[PDB]
């Protein structure tokens, strides 16, 4: 996609994540690095000793390299191996987890699948929900999506959709307030 | 000579050491300079780096230049021989009297 990450940021974790995404996406591969960084995220939270290792800053560069090699030399994309070696040289090993997470964000942005959340006061009947799918489908009609439900609003009989980063308000509460305000400003 | 010149900022000079570091206030001597350049350890910035103050002009230095750790602070010659003799801050005679 032009070896250009979704967004450019000057943050520490953002800088490395952007360079890795561009460098990774450059030659051929993006998913390989995604699985590698994902493994660190799962291991960073599952293994307690691994967390203390990265957070450790008083450790020497040569010592950090030996421990990283013990973890694994294979099953990690060369981009990931080169990234770790750079962090050790720049003492940025402590920022490893943030980089991992930040990288996945960019990858999730490239992912086409999106989650749409519908907010409604009254319970959505099985038949009613079916009609909602046809409306959302006919609206886009060119991208697959997964629907999620959450009913705890303050509005009554109103519909509010959240689709990743977009918000469309079809709530009746908005209509009520709009009319009550215009009827007051008639200036008769 | 287990030290190296990491950076040079005017008179201040940072030395990259390996293993043990020079104790604070110790006197370090640069190797390869035209004249004897002594550096007084001021503090340890961390990451095997130390910040020192140069006793002589730091002109002509180079990054990665080897530095030797004297192990002790600036040592100046004391005694009756200094009487009637002009001594430098680093203990060198500047009166051309030997």
């Amino acid at each position: 996609p032009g070896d250009k990450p979704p967004a450019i940021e000057d943050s520490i974790h953002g800088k490395y994540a952007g360079v890795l995404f561009s460098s990774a996406s450059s030659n051929k591969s993006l998913n390989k690095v995604a699985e590698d960084m994902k493994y660190f995220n799962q291991l960073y939270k599952e293994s307690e000793v691994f967390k203390s290792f990265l957070n450790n800053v008083s450790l020497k560069r040569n010592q950090q390299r030996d421990i990283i090699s013990a973890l694994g030399k294979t099953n990690f994309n060369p981009a990931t191996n080169n990234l770790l070696e750079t962090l050790i040289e720049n003492k940025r090993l402590d920022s490893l987890p943030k980089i991992a997470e930040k990288y996945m964000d960019y990858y999730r942005i490239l992912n086409k699948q999106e989650s749409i959340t519908i907010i409604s006061a009254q319970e959505l009947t099985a038949a009613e929900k079916q009609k909602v799918e046809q409306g959302l489908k006919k609206g886009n009609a060119n991208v697959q999506f997964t629907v999620v439900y959450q009913v705890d609003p303050a509005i009554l009989g109103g519909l509010q959709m959240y689709s990743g980063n977009n918000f469309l308000d079809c709530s009746l509460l908005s209509r009520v307030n709009k009319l009550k305000t215009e009827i007051a400003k008639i200036s008769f | 000579a287990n030290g190296q010149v990491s950076q040079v900022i005017g008179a201040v000079v940072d030395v990259q050491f390996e293993g043990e570091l020079p104790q604070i206030l110790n006197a370090l001597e640069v190797q390869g300079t035209q004249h004897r350049l002594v550096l007084e350890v001021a503090q340890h910035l961390g990451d095997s780096r130390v910040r020192t103050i140069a006793m002589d002009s730091t002109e002509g230095l180079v990054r990665g230049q080897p530095v030797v750790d004297t192990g002790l602070p600036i040592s100046v010659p004391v005694g009756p021989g200094t009487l009637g003799r002009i001594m430098n801050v680093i203990g060198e005679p500047i009166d051309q009297r030997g």
Binding site: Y39, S47, V49, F50, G72 | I24, Q43, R51
Partner: protein, 58 residues
């Protein structure tokens, strides 16, 4: 790769480095200067606690 690598990293940790003493009671000085020391791994310390360094200074 595998999730059980924690034991592998733990093994390399104890032998690879002659360090990592009882962290909960001991610590390492990252940096020293301007009358301030950056101790490391001095967990469980209390605000105002009295610590002692190697040379005996407190």
């Amino acid at each position: 790769l595998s999730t059980g690598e924690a034991s592998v990293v733990l093994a390399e940790k104890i032998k690879g480095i002659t360090q990592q003493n009882d962290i909960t009671e001991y610590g390492t000085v990252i940096s020293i200067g301007d009358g301030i020391a950056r101790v490391f791994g001095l967990t469980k310390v209390q605000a105002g606690e009295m610590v002692e360094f190697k040379s005996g200074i407190r």
